[PDB]
């Protein structure tokens, strides 16, 4: 159960939105 589709996209939309302002 729990595919890597939602599991991956889950954290993917958390670590990438960490800075929310920083350039690089």
Curated annotation (Swiss-Prot):
A GO molecular function held by the record: identical protein binding
PANTHER family: HUMANIN-LIKE 4, HUMANIN-RELATED
Domains: entry comment: Largely unstructured in aqueous solution.
Record-linked CDD domains: humanin
GO annotation, biological process: apoptotic process; cell-cell signaling; cellular response to amyloid-beta; intracellular iron ion homeostasis; leukocyte chemotaxis; mitochondrion organization; negative regulation of amyloid fibril formation; negative regulation of apoptotic process
Role played: Plays a role as a neuroprotective factor. Protects against neuronal cell death induced by multiple different familial Alzheimer disease genes and amyloid-beta proteins in Alzheimer disease. Mediates its neuroprotective effect by interacting with a receptor complex composed of IL6ST/GP130, IL27RA/WSX1 and CNTFR. Also acts as a ligand for G-protein coupled receptors FPR2/FPRL1 and FPR3/FPRL2. Inhibits amyloid-beta protein 40 fibril formation. Also inhibits amyloid-beta protein 42 fibril formation.
Chain residue ranges for the region called Sufficient for neuroprotective activity: 3-19
Entry superkingdom: Eukaryota
Name of the protein this chain belongs to: Humanin
Outcome when changing residue 9 to A: Abolishes neuroprotective activity and dimerization
Signal peptide: none
Presence of keyword Nucleus: yes
Effect on the protein upon substituting residue 10 to D: Abolishes secretion
Lineage of source species: Eukaryota, Metazoa, Chordata, Craniata, Vertebrata
Tissue-specific expression: Expressed in testis, seminal plasma and sperm (at protein level). Higher seminal plasma levels are associated with normospermia than with oligospermia, asthenospermia or oligoasthenospermia (at protein level). Higher sperm levels are associated with normospermia than with asthenospermia (at protein level). Expressed in retinal epithelial cells (at protein level). Expressed in the heart, skeletal muscle, kidney and liver. Lesser but significant expression is observed in the brain and the gastrointestinal tract.
Annotated organism of origin: Homo sapiens (Human)
